[PDB]
Design a protein around this ligand. Sequence first.
Ligand SMILES: Cc1cc2nc3c(=O)[nH]c(=O)nc-3n(C[C@H](O)[C@H](O)[C@H](O)COP(=O)(O)OP(=O)(O)OC[C@H]3O[C@@H](n4cnc5c(N)ncnc54)[C@H](O)[C@@H]3O)c2cc1C
Ligand SMILES: Cc1nc2c(=O)[nH]c(=O)nc-2n(C[C@H](O)[C@H](O)[C@H](O)CO)c1C
Ligand code: SF4
Ligand SMILES: [Cl-]
Ligand SMILES: [Mg+2]
Length: 509
Amino acid sequence: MAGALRLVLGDQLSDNLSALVDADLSRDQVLMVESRVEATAWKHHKQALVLVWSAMRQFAERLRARGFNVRYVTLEDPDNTGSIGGELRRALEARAFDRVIRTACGKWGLESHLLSLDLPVPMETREDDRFLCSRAQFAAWAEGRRELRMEFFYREMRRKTGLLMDGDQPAGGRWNFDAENRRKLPPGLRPPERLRIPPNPTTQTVLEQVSRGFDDHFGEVEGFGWPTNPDEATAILDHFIADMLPSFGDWQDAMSWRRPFLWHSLISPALNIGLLDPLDICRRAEAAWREGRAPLNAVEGFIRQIIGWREFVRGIYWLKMPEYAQRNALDAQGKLPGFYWTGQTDMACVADTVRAAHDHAYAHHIQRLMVTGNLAMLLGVHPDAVDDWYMVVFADAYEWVEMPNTRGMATFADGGIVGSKPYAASGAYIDRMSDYCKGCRYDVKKRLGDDACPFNALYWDFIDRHAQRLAGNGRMMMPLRTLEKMPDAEREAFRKQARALRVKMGVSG
Ligand SMILES: Cc1cc2nc3c(=O)[nH]c(=O)nc-3n(C[C@H](O)[C@H](O)[C@H](O)COP(=O)(O)OP(=O)(O)OC[C@H]3O[C@@H](n4cnc5c(N)ncnc54)[C@H](O)[C@@H]3O)c2cc1C
Ligand SMILES: Cc1nc2c(=O)[nH]c(=O)nc-2n(C[C@H](O)[C@H](O)[C@H](O)CO)c1C
Ligand code: SF4
Ligand SMILES: [Cl-]
Ligand SMILES: [Mg+2]
């Protein structure tokens, strides 16, 4: 009858967390740790550190106001062992407990370590039921499927959640209103100004501590504008729903120089730590369509990203780990170019993506996928180095979501499990979808020579290198038959260009 020690991690800041919902407030204690192991396993963006630790401190205060005894161990505490496991042991030695209760986390290596810890009391691990699909439900869906197609998973999630269902039929009589007709912004359309959250007093304190104590971590911390508690996160969501969602579908794949947010929701950093709930977000978007304040194609496209892609990538991560993290289907062995960290490249699209990561800890999906992701795949950068960049530079990065999007969708190192095909593209794609190329030093109409857009020769050398494997993929027919129709002299020409680019960029050779 000594009570339970209830662990809450930095991405578990939800009243409904499974480790909390049956607490005995008169006997139990919550443990929350600012852990330098977790902060440095990858050296996360300064803004990611500020976000998590500010949000953590405020959640602890919200728990105390509700009657919880909270043992909170800060980054400054001189007795903090630095690790979750060390701090569990320290808490169990400070007073009597009958058991530890925790919620399964979002990183296989940490989950595996915690499951193996030898503690003086039992540890009970509960599934994270903030997600809409359980790990077991995904495994059951996936069983027997030669290929995992997000669309079919998504339809099941629509039926299960009831989102955008009119009786037993999808709203509007189609499941998906996606189409491949998206374009860049018209020249006269200026993306709108976005709501930012000025740091509250707790956030300001953490910002000062991170600026002094983690100066070697990537990124700028001045200008921090992310929400750090439920009120701030709800303000950001309200702004998206009212002001941005009606145009969300039109501009979902566009890119505009030094306009990093466009009409995206900017909620992933808050949702991924628990400050928003995925079902609530989707119900709010559905209500906007049902009340006549947004079109169905925009609302369906937004919901598909949360109950479709987000749940799907989590499902594949837990289905396939730990071997997933060792897959390298294309035998990529190159080094990551230094300009991924410094931004010092004349490729305007790449430079702008690195700039947004540095200044905001954010870039939207198409930029992550088709600029820096595609480039790394075409260069043949080793997947560990690519994962290590995406885990550092964005404030929504956790392995369960980063890895299937990066090792899977963006670079095909998983051989197509997540994405079915490589999302390889030349500069022509970036030119069509962005305003980058007019002002770029390089010429997107050229493949060879010092003025040619590097993506153009790298794209064709990638298709060439992997032509047989992509033939046995079936989803690359338009490019492979273009390749086969080029004369040997044309193919040799772009092979030499791509080889020279990989040496110049510090990748290999
Ligand atoms: C290489 C690469 C790495 C990525 N790494 C991460 C990561 O570490 N963390 C992360 O949360 N997302 C990651 N994504 C997915 C996606 O790019 C981000 O979720 C999105 O950019 C967040 O911006 P937003 O909140 O403005 O989203 P919106 O464009 O407004 O989309 C709405 C919501 O849908 C979800 N979402 C959309 N696309 C995806 C997706 N492919 N996978 C999962 N959720 C999705 C998010 O919850 C997002 O908030 C990655 C994508 C790629 C291509
Ligand atoms: C930056 C950071 N800091 C902490 C921390 O101080 N304490 C903690 O308990 N968790 C932290 N996390 C989250 C974990 O590193 C990890 O990514 C998630 O628990 C994965 O589910 C992160 C990401
Ligand atoms: S020309 Fe090539 S490198 Fe320059 S912005 Fe366009 S796609 Fe990017
Ligand atoms: Cl993680
Ligand atoms: Mg000590």
